Ligand binder design. Structure first.
Ligand code: SAH
Lengths: 265, 265
């Protein structure tokens, strides 16, 4: 009679919370989805071994089209778990699944876990100063979306930081690197000429958040555009005007050039 | 030989990540602070039992003034952990403590935990639509803080949602309720008269996120300002322009007035 949305965390199988793990172990059936994102630091097998239950993976169609036919039926006479990378419901479409549960007469509970949305706090930048977020999507064919560029402009104009989620082709396990994102942004700038993203723009790259050894680098596009930030996933941030304390952290912890203390503060 | 920043999570001792627990259990010394937030579902004893170590609790003064004299010295010859509610680097100044660690020759690592900043996803509102965040602080003496009012105004003008962290006076066991936050906002409104926060403003309240049964309520200030949302902690949200799906969730899950379904595109 109960459905549990359980978050898996940032990177590997140990990023789930103790609460999530224990609940998952007591569920009769355990489902999971890896289309909204991937758990780059582990494998389905390792997650299964930790939970001690076989995990049935669901595709985007399985969920968006048949959630009420695949998952909910079992939740009627059993405790069912639905695992998702990060924190449940941080992905825009999963909240509606709670409504589906309701109309099916199934109780649902959410077990939270760390999300890159909150993990960016490790960049040393004040979380309250992050504005609207955006996703840098790979262009394709005659389609060249650029709304993420406008988001940076609007945030920066108000002295706010911009968190940029990078595109991912989960099915094919293809990660967009911060380098590719920087190249795309420069391309958009050349098209729009808004003076929003250039070689002189200060950016911050956070790679493999959740890991004990994430890569945290800060600096100007001209210097970081071809730098190796390690394996995915990568997150890109365009800070607004920095608080001195934010800048000091980027310099001392993220290897930012001393120049940011007088140019970006 | 190292210092660990480990989050404890939203509500109880099981909100710590498996990663955080396994590491905490192997540290030689464990410190913690419980003034940045409130974990309403646990106690020091239960946390100690789970980790199997004695925990020395530090006050805001111990940390901000003497972190390098109380914690860092031991981290030079031992494995030390510093525990905090939620995520250690979200809506705190703990990030700066990493700078102190570096300058003291101590390597530090961060272990994330669920944060209220991302947990708001359970309100059904799109995470990317949250703009700048703010804190509603208790007036003191002749001092009446009001900056949070301007944050709401700036976000709303952009159609963005506003997350409002509520004040806390740990040593006095005072946890600002959503009701008190609403009362303060109405007073600021009377002064600035910007039409930002009135009895007709739609707001969302999330209390005790992390628990299995958090209170999630949406409605007009006039109706919710005297409603009982249960024990603290609470956070207040002022939605911007709602998506249909956002409104649908608030109605179905948060008991919001069905009239908000009719969006004024
Ligand atoms: N479980 C919870 N439910 C509702 N609000 C919460 C909460 N935990 C924290 N808050 C809110 O955030 C304030 C503390 S701010 C510190 C937040 C913490 N680093 C984190 O990552 O969550 C509280 O006063 C309250 O307004």
């Amino acid at each position: 009679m109960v459905l549990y949305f359980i978050g898996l965390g940032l990177y590997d199988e140990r990023d789930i919370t103790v609460k999530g793990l224990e609940i998952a172990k007591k569920c009769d059936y355990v489902f999971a989805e890896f289309y909204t994102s991937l758990m780059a630091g582990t494998t389905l097998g390792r997650i299964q071994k930790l939970i001690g239950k076989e995990i049935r993976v669901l595709s985007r169609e399985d969920v968006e089209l048949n959630f009420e036919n695949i998952v909910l039926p079992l939740a009627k006479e059993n405790d069912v778990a639905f695992l998702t990378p990060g924190d449940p419901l941080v992905a825009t479409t999963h909240a509606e699944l709670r409504i589906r549960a309701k109309r099916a007469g199934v109780e649902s509970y959410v077990i939270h876990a760390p999300s890159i949305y909150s993990a960016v706090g490790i960049t040393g930048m004040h979380i309250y100063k992050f504005g609207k977020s955006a996703t840098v999507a790979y262009p394709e064919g005659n389609w060249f979306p650029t709304s993420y560029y406008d988001v940076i402009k609007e945030n920066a104009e108000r002295g706010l930081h911009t968190l940029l989620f990078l595109d991912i082709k989960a099915e094919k396990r293809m990660y967009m690197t911060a380098n590719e994102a920087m190249e795309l942004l420069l391309k958009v700038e050349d098209m729009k000429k808004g003076g929003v993203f250039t070689d002189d723009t200060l950016v911050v790259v956070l790679a493999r958040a959740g890991s004990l050894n994430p890569t945290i680098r800060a600096g100007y596009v001209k210097d970081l555009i071809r730098e190796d930030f390690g394996d995915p996933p990568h997150i890109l941030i365009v800070p607004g005007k920095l608080h001195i304390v934010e800048a000091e952290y980027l310099v001392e912890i993220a290897g930012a050039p001393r120049e940011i203390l007088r140019v970006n503060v």
